[model samples]
Target chain A: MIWKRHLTLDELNATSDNTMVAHLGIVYTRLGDDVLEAEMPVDTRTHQPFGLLHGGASAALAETLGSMAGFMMTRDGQCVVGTELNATHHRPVSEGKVRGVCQPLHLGRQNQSWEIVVFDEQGRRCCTCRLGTAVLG
Target chain B: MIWKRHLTLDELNATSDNTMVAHLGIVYTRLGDDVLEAEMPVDTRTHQPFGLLHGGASAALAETLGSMAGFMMTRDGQCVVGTELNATHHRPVSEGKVRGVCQPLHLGRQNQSWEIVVFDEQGRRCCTCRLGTAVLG
Candidate 1:
């Protein structure tokens, strides 16, 4: 399998999101305006009985990426993590990579919120996520 | 403490959503879409570290009620259970019971979708939920 690293370790390590799962098979591709996009590798282990990536993993990806965006906008020495996340699964992604693009909803001094949109290899929207978090020190 | 149960099987059969962490409380005296309306309770355990009900538990309640709605709509010997659920915590409920009402979004021959709205005791909207499932025999 081909692999690529989009975001440097410094950028990822700087934030306190679930680095273990986020870095499992994920690589960042875009970062701008409090927004970040990353790719989550799909493997046999991710599949459910339906032969597609389980929805829980999709929820995990949304939370992971959203928290990173929240952390990026947080104050120095402060941490931002997801307090809640909700997602809608529009379709099943049977194969190939699923890309997660996270963008800001409200970035405030005390809180940050973002929406995550996941697409399949063909660019069809598979899921939409909304995440909310508060700053912690 | 005030207690009310529209339907109950027993104590052990209860999940976290039923009591203890009854975060989906609503105060609406009347609820339903001409089908099902139930008054639920919420307690302190529902709160997260920040003193507000955890959002994931809200989704759980939303899906739980939505699943029941689907079951009621199905024909005899058929069952319907939630397969995917997405919820948005628009606001917080600090005290009192929260009333929840659900309605069918799409009830096709093979599948069904539900939308749930939860309100606090003061008649304030707290959440909006989208739940989906497939019919089973």
Candidate 2:
């Protein structure tokens, strides 16, 4: 596992409380040996004026998941700060839930990179993201 | 002005109603001759677990301003769709309002690129962003 220490869904949820992740209604759903997944609602809070999913919401979810994944792999006294995030939005969803799956692309002593893919309820890809983080003590 | 049609504050606000922009407490503040600006509050809704500004919220604000700028520059039969976005968070703001200023970097028949800079209440740099959009019929 890339994560230096085990992290649970409940722990992730607890850490996210009262944060932008919670504000966007994103819930941690699963934590695997090497990946993390979360779900976000496509309701009023995440929708655009035309009733489609806002691309910014997708970017937010992508950064949220990627940063969390990077943080999980950090050791004691080490912290991760997001440096850059790039996202390509493919489709738009109006309602229901979109799931974000995040996995590390590169894990080094000084930096980490993660790829996050968001899918609609029907399993169609909605957005793809790559995020880079700098590891600092 | 690069904008094909003059966009007033009322028109921009009207277009953003009921969207994620409104949900995040983002309000259009100005429409300059060649620039655009908006303000987002760093309230509970936009904070991270540590009570600092959420980077995702910064991204959302960046994309919102850049996308709106591109949309404003579109022609009658042409529409703009966000293709890529990159954001670099500089300083963290825990309270008060952060303003995002967006300016066009490149405007072409097929693509548009915008540079967005976010400033904290004290006029310190908070984040920098670049967004690219594809022009579609």
Candidate 3:
């Protein structure tokens, strides 16, 4: 119930076309009242040099979902920009997939804080991120 | 002068073959005395929905260079894993290329800290990152 704008999965996902979100194979999967969610496969495209899940890949997925919430919660003609983002990796995954769930920590008029927690296939926390944004009209 | 393993441009760039680094068009461009540098273009593949440089793309470049340093500075048979990463965005770029310079803030046998500063084509800082890693021997 936090969104000011509504988006179907198709509309939300189509925005990623030809962008890094699409290039990284992230798909918007759920739009809940209080959360946004997506999934990314843990494969070669998401692997680091040592063949484990790349921290960057985890970062991308987190921002994608958080940014989506950032936009949805804003008023018309107002957009959001990332000011800071931080991620902590708790576990390593070499196979299967990771799911990211994004929720707002603070949704203010001009400043916002978001949290995205990433879980592996078995639903264990793998990474957690905090994103801060500034709303611009 | 900090490398334990050497790398030519070809050797460094080849490690990105068929990976997200290649897909996003990031490449290792310089290996300095204590800094590793890379460049990424602000184009379709790296842009977000509004056609600006994505923060996650910025994070990827930062970690890529820092993680490479993490590997190079280690002894053979040892590896590094990203435990945490954080980035603060200062400016937005919609075109041209951004250069990332990564240097170590702390180098330990088991715990390491690396810093990456990303600059736009005009040499203005766009983002700064700190990467924390754990060495696996």
Candidate 4:
């Protein structure tokens, strides 16, 4: 909880409308003491041509949670920007929702790193993502 | 152009109507002998709360082009699945559209790689992406 200000689920949901998070059908389902969780559907909106969940969609989910987590750590006049993102797909999911959990890896004054793990409905690991964010004014 | 079948713009568009490509407002704009190109808008639908294009959107555009490029190389009974994706954001775009151009890095029997570069309306590079796809039957 090294956040500049306390984070809440409502503040996250308040920006949910008219954003890629909304367009991608991603929902922030939970906010734990040290982790953030979001879920995305694997329907046509997130599927590849072969009807499986798109790895990019999983990357999107990872960036969403990682960036938001970095944002929460920023000060009043600061903001977070994504610098790099990488994901490895371990499983292919075709149906149901995939959930991503973000954990802070390195939290610095100007840089932050987050590790995001996406899991399928059956609790199998689908993707592992790493995101780097830069804190800017 | 080492494709199993020549890729066309129409087929790409026809598939764009109902998938994640459509959800992210990405459109296939051009098909060339050795490259594939696409454009995505930077509006509310693809923007983050700070009014800039989301990094995930750039990743989505990159993935779309890279995956399509890999798909074009598949035979009648083969399909391509994305295994890994990495993106680095270099510029911030808040208006207009960004275009992505994908080129093959490696084309193998069971594996393929694509390099996708995204540029802003000003023709400045915004992101660089590399994708790995596994050919499956």
Per-residue lDDT over A11-109 for candidate 1, one digit per residue giving the tens place of the 0 to 100 score = 674432323243234567767554678776665434432345555456656766776667556556775556667777777777788998988887676
lDDT of 1 by residue, B11-117 (tens): 31233232212223322233333434445555443333233444544554565566565655666677554567676667876555566677777777677888878
Candidates arranged by lDDT, highest first: 4, 3, 2, 1
Q: What's the lDDT of the predicted structure labeled candidate 1?
A: 0.60
Error of 1 at B49 (Å): 18
Q: Tell me the spans in candidate 1 whose CA falls farther than 4 Å from its real position.
A: A1-10, A13-24, B1-84, B87-131, B134-137
Q: State the lDDT of candidate 2 residue by residue for A21-80, as single tens digits.
A: 898999999898888999999988888766778888998898889878888888878767
> Which pairs in model 3 have colliding backbones?
A1-A33
Clashing pairs in 4: none
Q: What docking grade does candidate 2 earn?
A: medium
Q: Give lDDT tens digits, candidate 3, residues B1-137.
A: 88888888789999998677776788889888899999999997888999899999999888788888998888889988889899999999989999999999999989889999999999999999999989898
Q: Is the docking of candidate 1 incorrect, acceptable, medium or high quality?
A: incorrect
Q: Candidate 1: TM of chain A?
A: 0.83
**Which prediction has the highest lDDT against the true structure?**
4
Off by over 4 Å in 4: none
Best by DockQ: 4
Model 3 misses residue A78 by how many Å? 0.9
Considering only chain B, report the TM-score of each candidate against the true chain B.
0.72, 0.97, 0.97, 0.96
Cα lDDT of all candidates, in order? 0.60, 0.87, 0.89, 0.90
Docking class of 3: medium
